[PDB]
Every structure is written in structure tokens, then in C-alpha cells.
Write a protein that binds this ligand. Structure first.
Ligand SMILES: Oc1cccc(-c2ccccc2)c1O
Ligand SMILES: Oc1cccc(-c2ccccc2)c1O
Ligand SMILES: Oc1cccc(-c2ccccc2)c1O
Ligand SMILES: Oc1cccc(-c2ccccc2)c1O
Ligand SMILES: Oc1cccc(-c2ccccc2)c1O
Ligand SMILES: Oc1cccc(-c2ccccc2)c1O
Ligand SMILES: [Fe+2]
Ligand SMILES: [Fe+2]
Ligand SMILES: [Fe+2]
Ligand SMILES: [Fe+2]
Ligand SMILES: [Fe+2]
Ligand SMILES: [Fe+2]
Lengths: 288, 288, 288, 288, 288, 288
């Protein structure tokens, strides 16, 4: 079973715009480069987000983390049993990602996934944000979450839960029109209420947004003003019905992909109960 | 010395509008009437806000509280020494306000003030809000605060500090134009960062707004949506530079008088230091 | 200034009934005798309540405590300045009361008061209740409180506050008839919300009741059942509007004198505010 | 006013016996010598107890500490006003005691007292006990306490309270015979329930005992066994009625002078109340 | 009485070197300029340290803060009574320093001091360090401390304590040679163990060093490595005997002026006791 | 599975030097002898470190602890299944080691290991350090850790994890030259981040160092100065990247074997994640 989401790689048309966005607006720390990919940090890991030039303007891959070598072999066993194709990353890839081992595969709809273990940490180069943010909530909960767009939620659910070991937290019927709603399924693989949400949205992107969680409410408030100064705000502040994350949304430089920046959600444990919600926000989140 | 702000009375042109506003939108509890004044509660006091019909569309009076009978006589002594005219409230007024004694006077610019002691409490009729609000922060800090508009800040400061015993917390230069700012003076008389702020604003109202503080951030979030549904929002959520109150503003039914609804400020004590700020918001509070 | 109420002495027609009442029902510890007075303990003091035979069926005296010898002399000075007659207790009385010194006087309406210091404690004979009670709340707050009946509340207030140093906490208008109420004044001399309450009740007793405070709510619950088994209950459980004590009342063997047995009130400090209440109970206390 | 007891000096006939006693049995740290005086530490101070050869076999002097230079001059002023003779310690004495200034005087019955300020600390030579003891409770409460034998308690009380600023905590009537008791007066000058107790005992020593307080109950338990192995125990474990110190007593090498080694007493503050006790122990302390 | 040390201004020969030093090595935030002075922040204040070109290579002035306007006038009164010359800062200076009022004077040996109130804060531009540091401990304790070199400690003590209201914490005899020591006097004006220390050192600088206190021990550890990479370390890590600050020292670009960077000292209150120490370090601080 | 590391035995050429080193410098308590082995304590166990004369100047054996008799038999079963030779310790050895049972074996490269249960404790002889140290962190985490030098890390890993039940925490690539690094594997068997680390170092010793963890940072600071006075320091203070232990290193009297003395690491639990680090220190640890 996947333990947490550890990294994201984007392929974008405007690297300089993404660079400014991730550092000056979001607050991530610039962390050099690996080949043609620019690297960004949010904590002690050598990198958390990679940005490389490309026409996709989308998520290129997502790194799914396990706790040790044996766990990785067990995942390989699960993939084999499920008939899911995969390739072991070679030395060059391991060195590029800074991991001790990885399996390369795709989800049922073409998103490359990399299951890995043994990521590099660099405590001798302590994290220093590029903008005022006290810090990000990562650790055992991983880097954050993202919404995976899919054409068949049922099929997507079978793969993420039966193969990768994610678990359903809850469902929100997200209103699309006067008489049309999309049942978004929010999935956890640790204490983070959701690490991946599945939704049949009509957008031409692999993902709808990625989310980062900051330590304080002020972190979120200040970030709002920075993104507003950049003219990127897509929602006012609000708080979600399901995880109680207080956040706002903004456009990334890649069309139709947003970032969510939030604080203070509830966490999940073994006693979690599946529920359904008719709205995404308990309050706020008006679209701008 | 005044211990806290205990009550506010408004004279307005649309009582039904104010009634709906205070109950369904703000969350106060309807508490009957006393003569032609409708009464509203925020806690265990018999009333905190009174609304009566009148062409003023403004604050008619403010109740300033002291802790006992001797304290009231000491205030009478201070008023006499300062040459400030006042009248002792008669039995009819005491019965109307539900207090054991009061002194009626005006500030240097015509706002009626009532210094009182011994207010009525009704614990046998526990507070029940008219809208979802976990509760208000009152107690020793009083009902909240208001911004007193004045034509001469220096003169106003001498009266409120030298006569009534308020103390300056800090000053914010509130930008009015490209090269014009108003030095707002925020005053305390207890732990509440400010109970009265003095400002030379060019509006034709005795006050710019009154403020209520709720127990939780969700209280504020939910209230925002209620006031937005009523079409009354004047500012987005934000957090102040001086008291760190997280709030939003909305129009009352009386033109040019707003309400501020907030949470989580810092409090003051004997070790407080006077400072100056160039902005009212550390983040947010964009005008709408 | 009086620091706390330390002891009470009753003169009663049925000593055996009072003995059973204080021990088997209330839970006090039998502590021998001193002359014709039976002694009862509630904590580490050698005694707290004394019961002696007499036709009064009433409170014979109340012991008011100060912290040291100098404090006692200062009280003697206050009594002299106020023109209040008093006599220094002789060795025999000091030995009888187990105190290092005392002043004997009366309040304006004939209740004997004894101001003392240096009471005897007996930690080598640890308190053991006669009925199931985890313990009583005494210490700096003294033994409890009592309601002093007076024919002139104003006169009584001047003596207790101006001479003895008690301070008004609040007032409750206790309804006596359809259009008649008695303004009961509750006074403190330490953290205990009230140690003495003054009221112009039409009963022929020096006091309306005395009160003891137990450590837990169960203490109160169990005591209710014991007093109910004895057929003495006068009120159901309830909670007061002013001090938030949760209690019930019961008859003592002396006609028209009750006992109040309670738990969990709020305490007072320097920031206390005088208020007025129209009811004695926020909930409960129905008369039985 | 004296702030705390800081040091004790003994003049004894058997220095080696005292050396072994203070180190191997009590647990103090050997700290070299100053002239013919051996020094012992209990914490960060350069020394706390001094032992020098002499026929007295008794306390030679006690050091009473104040917080600064001005405080010392104020004490000199009090001594002058009271007619108490004193001499300012010269440089040689200051250097010997390791203090910034001192006044040498005697109590009314010949015990030399030294009022000082600015004691030497040696944090670069951290305290290391000579026997298993987690540490001693000193700090603002000073080194411990002692019982001062006096022929006239009233006279002694006037000096210690009126001149030195000590305050009475309480009195215990210590039984000497079938119909004879000694009223011991326990005095504080800080949070320590008592720093000096005054008693008219019929022993030929300036003091009855000195006391040290350890951090844990085990400290006391282990110390008991060490002193028992040395054949010095004079009392079983017990707990005092007045300060609730749990301790035992043992003989020092000087006849009729004991040491008390204890733990866990209650402390005093401004709200302390004078009381009287008929026993020294709530439990235990049987004489051996 | 001075409440805290609020700012420091240096006049130096190598501004670029100081700029790099304060930002990349120490971690302060660059905050623009005011005239020919570069400004640096450590928290919410508009500035804390100023650096301007000059041949002094030394501290040009120190800002001493009070809590309000009345306090400033009271300081002016103290200066007048003491015969100390001073000039009220004009509008240009007030605007330059960003304060509501100030008095300009010098200490007895020529160090310019500025007593001020009403400093500017900029919460809308949250502090962002230039190097990895979780934050600095300032607030009521002010910016940090400095060691003031003086030729006459007695004279310096009279001015700082009798005129400015500082209070002696303790003294350390700092060894200079085999038989020569300098009695350094550490002074407080708030909870910070020392804000100014006075010492008769034989260096040709107004100050020996200034000190900044960080939130964590890691902050100090990481800063050590940064300053070591710059070749500026003058002492190994160590902990002081008097305040228990754990720190290290490094050279600033101005010859013979160092910076101390530390964490975790003890704080002082009304119960503080003057003591003397023979060493500056309980452990560590070896000179490099 | 091994539960913790309980004891270490060294065979050395200079017993007196080791004796002084372990007591006066490190702070261990001398605990007599057993045959030709000198014994040393760090807590309530009868002994933790043994030193005997021998030409090895190295670790002679390490004691690996299990919780009960059944656990020991289960370990014997694991050794048999794995084909690892072992001998049950006879009565003489059990008596020498003070254990209820033990199995004697060697790791793949000749280090004798003893798996035991039922160690002797001596609470009646409470631990007393020979130098100032508040205490050591042992308990369920065992005595500390050591770095086991091995010529084949893969082979060593298979034995320690597959046979003894240790688990990999993380890996650090320890730089040996400009283009050469050694992958050190840190292993846990309880909450202690590592109890044994495996590394292919080119030194001629069975171990690179052993480590003891003290209760406070001051413990470490003071120990540094003691070892520096002895001329044994090999590293400055620093903090590790993987366990966050703050420590320093020093030479033992046996050439090329060091001691690490530290404080405050993070602990591990079931949710631990394997990671890789490029440095041993987040800060400090410069070689001396
Ligand atoms: O973290 C989250 C929690 C709940 C809902 C959303 C969501 C809202 C709008 C569109 C897609 C998802 C979300 O992002
Ligand atoms: O509570 C408050 C704290 C700081 C500023 C304001 C304010 C803002 C705009 C206009 C008037 C006042 C305020 O209300
Ligand atoms: O403790 C108390 C607090 C408030 C009211 C009463 C009271 C009620 C009925 C009659 C007399 C007093 C009381 O006893
Ligand atoms: O600390 C103490 C507290 C109470 C009593 C004693 C005492 C007992 C016997 C003889 C003298 C004093 C004591 O030492
Ligand atoms: O903060 C401090 C506390 C104690 C001593 C010093 C000090 C040490 C060497 C030279 C000058 C001062 C210091 O800086
Ligand atoms: O406890 C530890 C944690 C991390 C690294 C080391 C280490 C450093 C240098 C050489 C060998 C090991 C260590 O001792
Ligand atoms: Fe989301
Ligand atoms: Fe406001
Ligand atoms: Fe009552
Ligand atoms: Fe004693
Ligand atoms: Fe310093
Ligand atoms: Fe190590």
C-alpha cells in the first residue's frame, strides 16, 4: 500500500513564469536543477516539485512513496497480480529522482506514476522559503494532494483502492450545472484527509489542481494577497465541508490548472466514517 | 476610569430591516422591547443593543460601564473636576436601561454617553442566537468596539483619555487618497485591544462602524456568507495590523454605518507599547 | 478587613437531632465536646460548627477570621473608630474557641460576632466524614456562607462593608409575592462569591440558612438522597444565577433554618463587576 | 528585610567526622577550604556550609541574604534605627565569605549573624553530590532552615520580625513533659514555610538542628538508610503538621545538634494564615 | 525608566561587507534604505539595525525605547533633574527613525543615545529572513544586547542605573591576564537578563559586541556553520554562567567588534538576586 | 528479535587510563570488579560497561537483550534455522555477567555477541556519577549505540536484519575522499534511532565508536570541556542529519576507537520511513 504522495513533476510552456510562481508567490525554495528540470523544496527533502519545459502544461508524473525496500517489492508483487504493467527505474533515473529504487507505471488513464522508497534529505541545507511562509505541513502526510481528472470514476476507484491501497474518505457532489453534478471521491493513504481526489470533470487536464498546506492561518492570508497582487486568484477564502481545510485557489501559469493553498484540516484515522456532502464549502470559496 | 463598553443604542429609519439584520444575519437574540425600543442580546445581559425608530440612522448613545456604586460617584467627581456637564438618570431611565445608576453626558462632539453600574443579567433565560454563532466574546472586555468619528482628534483624545480614563494602544495612518491619510487612534480601557477608536473621517455619521467578536473562525466564515446572501458585504476577510483581529465588514441598514464581525485578536495588558502602522490590514480586507 | 468566615455556633432545642443531622446526613465529623457544646469538623480545623442546648433554635454566633495578631489589632482600631462596642475575649474563651485571640461584638441587629486569629488545627487526626462526601471546599474561602436576616438592609450594608470590610458582589430581587420582592445583597471578603448575604426576609430567625460546599457533584447528589430519606428536602437541585453554585436546600432540626449543600460555583477576584438578577436560580431549585 | 538564609558556619571538635557526615552521609559536595574552614556545596554557590575546628561544637554564624547593595544599606539603616550594634565586614572577611558586602551583628542572645549580598557562584564547576541525592531545593528559598534556641521567645520574636523582617507562619506547642509544652514559633522570609524557628528548649546549644530539603522522596529514603548505617538516626520518617515536610532526623557529630533531611513541604505566600498546632507530626517521626 | 533596547545604528567602512554579513550570514532581512543608511529587520518593526558609510567602524547610536508619550516626557524630566544635556529630535529625524518622538543625548563617554516612543511596524510586509533562522526573540525584551566599553565603570553605572533606570543583574570578573581581571556589570531593564553590560576593556571601540537571540538551538548551530564558512568565528559554542545563553561569537566586518548569536537564556523578574561569577562560561566558548 | 543493546565489554592495554576516562571524564560510576574485569554503571543495572586487560584495545563483546526466557529460546530457534553457531553460557558465565541465561555467538566477521535475558539490577545502590552528569538515557532504549566496522555491508545487513531482527532506519553516504564515500547503514531494534550502524570503514578496529546519551544539553556541554581538558576531543559540537542527536566525539585510550556523547535525538516508531542523507551533520561536528 502507498504510504504518501512525495513529489510532483510538471511539464510546462513557461518555466520562468512557474519559477516565479512557485517561489515569490507560493513560497517554495529554489533548489537548483537536475538536467532540464528546475527543482523546488518545501521542507528537508532534496526536492518536492520539479518543473521542466514541455508543451503539456500539465502534471508529467507523481511520486508515490513507501517506507522501505521490502515495501517496494510488495508493491511490485501487487502490480504483477493485478496485471498492471511497470518498469523498474534504472540507475540514471534513480540518480535523477534521488531515490533508492522506483517502479514506473501509469494509472488507467495515462498519468505516469512512480512508486519509490529511500528519498534524499538535505538537513545540512535547511529549508528557507522564498516568500513569507512559516512552513508547510508534510512529514508522514506527504507533500499535499491533487485532484485527478478521470473519464470513468468507477474504473479509477478500482485501481487506486484495489491496486494502490488508497481508501475512500468521502464523496462530494460538485454542482456543474442546474441539474448536473459530479461525484468527486476523496481518497486517503495516511492521516491526510485526502491525498488524491477522483472526479469526472470536463477539463482537458490530467489534474484540476494540486494543494499545499501551510502551518498557520496567517500563512494562508498572506499568500492570498501575494497571489492577488499577481492577478491569479480564482476563489475567495473558504473552508471545505469534508476535510475542514481553510484555503483559497489560484491559477498556475498552466491554463486550467490551479493551486490550492490551505490550513487547519481535520485528519483521519482507523475510525473514519464514509459520508456524502452536497457542497464543497461549509463557507466561503466564492469563485472569482 | 471606564471599565468597558456595555451597550449601544441606535435610532434608525428602518427598524424591521435592522431587526432582521441583527438576528438572521449577525446572530443576536431578540429580547423583547422597552417602550419603542427593540432589544437584542449577545450573552447573559438583559440587552446589549437597542434599536428605536428615528431619522438619525445613527448611534443614539453608548453605555460605558464601571464596577460599582463608588466607582460611579468617582466618575461624577472626575466630570465635575473637568467641567463636563452631566445629569443623573432618574428612576424611569434607570428602569428603562435596567441599571442601578447612571450619569448622562455627551462627548465634546455631541455623542450621548451614559456611565452606569449594576446592569441586569438574566441567566434563567440563557442566550440563544438567531443564526449559527457559537457565541460572542464579551465579559470583562465588554460588548465590542466602535469607531468614533470626530472633527478634532486631539480634542477627542484629551476627553477620552484625561476624563474617561481610556489609554492609547496605537495609531494607524489610514490612507484616504494618494497623498492624504487619517491618523486613527485606537484606545483601550481593559484587555480588549480597542474599545473606541478616534478618527477624523469625512463621513456624516457619529460612528464609522461597531464591531462584535465571535468565539471561532468558523463563526466569522459563516457570518460572511449570511451577510453576502443579504448583499451587504463591504470587505473581504482580512486581519488587522494592530489587534490581529480576523474579520470582515458589512453595511448595516443605516447608510454609511458598517458592522465588523471578527475573531482572534491579541489582548493588551500593563506591558503594552504604543506603536504606529501604515496599513489597517496585515492581509486581506480588500474593499468590495 | 475580615478575611473569611471560620466557624458557626448554634443553640438548639434538640441536640441529638442536630448531631444526627450534621453527621449521618450532612457528613461532618463528630469532634468531641467543649463544655456543653458538641463539636463538628469539615476539615483540618479542630472544629467548624458547634451545637449547644438552648431555646433559641438559631445561630448563636459566627466567627470571623483574620490572618494574624496585627490584623486583629487593626480590626479593634476599626471598631473603635466606628464607635462599635466590643470586648476582648478572656483566656477561658480563647481556650474554649481554640484561638490565639478574639474580639466579641454584635452586628447592628444583635447577632454576636467574634473576630479571631490563630485557630487550632489537628492534622494528626485527619478529617473522616460521617457520611459519603469526598470533602468540603474551605481553605482560604472559609467554611461556607450564611444569609443574615435584617430589618434594614441599608444599615446592615454600611456595617458589613464600611466596618468589617466585606464587598458587594451582586443583588438578586427575590420574589416574595405577586408584586413584592426582597433585594438580597451578596457580599464577599475573599474568592468565595459570597460569605454573607443580607436580606429583609419576614422570618423570625437570625439567619435563613447556612451553606457548605462539597468537592464534587456526586457529593451533592448523594447528600440529596440522604436528606430526602430523612424527609428534610426543601428544594430540588438547581444552580444559582449569581455564583453558579449547584445545590439543594433542606431543613435543619431548627424550624425555619435551612442548610444549603452545593458544588462548583464561580469565584471572584479584583476584576469583579456588580450586577443585578431577577431570579435566584438559572435553573432548578423548585420548592418542595 | 532579609530575603533568605544563605549559609551556615559550624565550629566543631571533630572536623573529619563532620566532613564524612556532610559528604558520604548527607550528600554535599566537598568544595576545598578557606583558611582553617572546610567548605561544602549543595548547589551552584561557591559554598553553603563551612566547618572549622573549635570547642563550641555548635553553629558559629549564619548568613542572611539580601538581593543587592541598596538592600544592604537599608538593612544597616534598620539596625541603626533599632539600636542594634553592627560592624561592616572588611575586605579580608568579604574575600573569605566570597560576598560583595556584609554587616556583622548578633541576635539578642549571642548568635553571630552576617547580612550580605552578592555571593559567588561557580557554574563552571557544576554541583556533584558525594552521595546519591538528585539535588537540593535552594534557589529563592535559600539553603534550608534551622531552629534557634532562645531563653525568651517574646524578645527573640521582636528582633527577628521587627528588625530583620521575618514573619510568623505558625506555632506548635511541642510537648516536653506530661504537663509542659514549648511554644515553637516558625518564621518565614520567603516561600519556604520556615527558615528560622524560635523555641525555648532546655538544651545547651545555639540551635536544635539545621534542615536540608531534597528534590525527591527517594532522596530522603536513601539518606535515611545511609544515616542509619552510620548509627545516627534519631527519628523515623514522618511528616510535619505545619509545613507538611516529609523528613527524618539524625545526630550530627556535635552532641545535641541534629540534622533534618526532608522533602515536599507546602510553600507560603501573601495569603498565608497564622494557625496553631498541638503536635509536630501529622504522622510518623517516632523518636529513636 | 528605559523599557528596552530597540535599535542600533552602525557607521562602517565596508557597507557591502556588512550587508552580506547581516543578511547571508546572520539572517536579517534587507529592508531598503533611508538616506545613506541601509536598513535591516529582525521582526515586525520597520527596521532594527541601520548601517551607513563612515570611518568610525563602530556603533553610531543606540535607540532606547519607552512605552508612550508621557513616558518620554518623564524621561526628559529625569534628564533635566540629572543635568544631562539633550535635544528633542526634529520632524526630519523623527521621519528618518520612524518614531513618534525622541530625545537625543550621549552617555558620559560620548555614545549617542536616542530615547524614543511610537516606532513604526509593518505587519503587511511580514519578516522573511535572508538565511535559515526560525526567528529572533525580541518583543518586550527588545532587539538584544550590547557590551558598552567604558573607562570608568563606577561613573557608567551611576548614569545607566540612576538616570536611565537600568538595574544590575550581576557581575563577572573577566580574566584579562594572569593577575588582571575586569569586573563586567550586566544590566537589565526588562526580562532580558542583560540589555547592556558595562566593562573597562582595553579595546578602541565603543562596544565589544552586540547580541541577537534566536528561537531555537538549531538556529544557533546553523548560524555557526554559516559564519565559519565566512571565516569569522571567534569562539566555539558555549553557555554563559550568568544568563545561561547558549551562543558563539564572530567578527563583524568592523575590526574588534563582534556579534554574539545565541539561544535559551534564563529571564529575570522582581525576585532577581545580585551574584558574582569568576568565569563568563559555564562550559564552552573556547577562543578561536 | 533483539530488544535492545544492554552491555559492552572492552579488552584494553591501559586499564587505568580507561578507568579514569570512563569515570572522571565520561561520568560513569565505578562498580567494583568481576574477575579481572573492572565494572562501570550508567543507571540501575549492576553494570553496563566492562574493561579487562588485553592486547586487543577493542570491543571484546556486546550484550544483546531480550525480555524473557521464552524470547531467548525463540532466538536460539532463529539461530538454528539460520545455521548460525552458538553455545549456551554455563553457570560460571551467567554468574559473571549477572544474567539468567545467555547464548554466545559471533557476527559474520568475528565480533562476539551474547544474547541474554534477566539482568541484575541494584536499586539499593542508586547510581552516582563520577563526574557532573544529570543522568543517561537508557531504559527500553538500552545503553546507547555503536558503529560496527564490516568488510561487506550487504552480508552484515542480512545477518543483523534477517537473523537478529534489527531494522534499517536510514543510510548516510559518509565522504571519505574527493570521489569516495561509504554508505553507513543505521539500524534500530527499539525507539532509539540507531543501536548499531554498519559501515565499511578502513580502520583496523571492530568498532569506530560507542555512544552514550545524556539527559540534558548541559550534560553534553560540560562533558566536552572535561574531555577537552584531557586532550581527547576529536570533533566540535554538532547535530546529526538522521537522528538529530546533538553530540561531540572524543578518543578513548584505545587507538582509533572514539566515544560519542550526545543529547536530544528523535526517536522512531512503526511509521518510520527509510531515507538517505549525503552528510552526517546538519550542522557542526567539525573534525579537530
Ligand atoms: O481539497 C478539496 C476538498 C473538497 C473539495 C475540493 C474541490 C472543490 C472544487 C473543485 C474540485 C475540488 C477540494 O479541492
Ligand atoms: O478594528 C479595526 C482595527 C484596525 C483598523 C480598523 C479600521 C479600518 C478601516 C476603517 C476604520 C477602522 C478597524 O476597524
Ligand atoms: O447561595 C445563594 C445564592 C443565590 C440565592 C440564594 C437564596 C435563595 C433563596 C433564598 C435565600 C437565598 C442563595 O442561598
Ligand atoms: O521543621 C520542623 C517543622 C515542625 C516541627 C519541627 C520540630 C520538631 C521537633 C523539635 C523541634 C522542631 C521541625 O523541625
Ligand atoms: O552575553 C554575555 C554574558 C556573559 C559574558 C559575556 C562576555 C564574554 C566575553 C567578553 C565580553 C562579554 C557576554 O557577552
Ligand atoms: O550517531 C551517528 C549518527 C550519524 C552519523 C554518525 C557517524 C559520523 C561519522 C563517522 C561514523 C558515524 C554517527 O556516529
Ligand atoms: Fe483540493
Ligand atoms: Fe474596527
Ligand atoms: Fe445560599
Ligand atoms: Fe525543622
Ligand atoms: Fe554578550
Ligand atoms: Fe554515532
Amino acid at each position: 500500500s502507498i504510504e504518501r504522495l512525495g513529489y510532483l513533476g510538471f511539464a510546462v510552456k513557461d518555466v520562468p513564469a512557474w519559477d516565479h510562481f512557485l517561489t515569490k508567490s507560493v513560497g517554495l525554495m529554489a533548489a537548483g536543477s537536475a538536467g532540464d528540470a528546475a527543482l523546488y523544496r518545501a521542507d528537508q527533502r532534496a526536492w518536492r516539485i520539479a518543473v521542466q519545459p514541455g508543451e503539456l502544461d500539465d502534471l508529467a508524473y507523481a511520486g508515490l512513496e513507501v517506507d522501505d525496500a521490502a515495501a517496494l517489492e510488495r508493491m511490485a508483487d501487487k502490480l504483477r497480480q493485478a496485471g498492471v504493467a511497470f518498469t523498474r527505474g534504472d540507475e540514471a533515473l534513480m540518480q535523477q529522482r534521488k531515490v533508492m529504487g522506483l517502479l514506473c507505471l501509469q494509472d488507467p488513464f495515462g498519468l505516469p506514476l512512480e512508486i519509490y522508497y529511500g528519498p534524499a534529505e538535505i538537513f545540512h541545507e535547511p529549508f528557507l522559503p522564498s516568500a513569507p511562509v512559516s512552513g508547510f505541513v508534510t512529514g508522514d502526510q506527504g507533500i499535499g494532494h491533487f485532484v485527478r481528472c478521470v473519464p470513468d470514476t468507477a474504473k479509477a476507484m478500482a485501481f487506486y483502492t484495489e491496486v494502490l491501497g488508497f481508501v475512500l474518505s468521502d464523496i462530494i457532489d460538485i454542482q456543474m450545472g442546474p441539474e448536473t453534478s459530479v461525484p468527486a471521491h476523496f481518497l486517503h493513504c495516511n492521516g491526510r484527509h485526502h491525498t488524491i481526489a477522483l472526479a469526472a470533470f470536463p477539463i482537458p487536464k490530467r489534474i484540476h489542481h494540486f494543494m499545499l498546506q501551510a502551518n498557520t492561518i496567517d500563512d494562508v492570508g498572506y499568500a492570498f494577497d501575494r497571489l492577488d497582487a499577481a492577478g491569479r486568484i480564482t476563489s475567495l477564502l473558504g473552508r471545505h465541508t469534508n476535510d475542514q481545510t481553510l484555503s483559497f485557489y489560484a491559477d498556475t501559469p498552466s491554463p486550467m490548472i490551479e493551486v490550492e493553498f490551505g490550513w487547519g484540516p481535520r485528519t483521519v484515522d482507523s475510525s473514519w466514517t464514509v459520508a456524502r456532502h452536497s457542497r464543497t464549502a461549509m463557507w466561503g470559496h466564492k469563485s472569482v
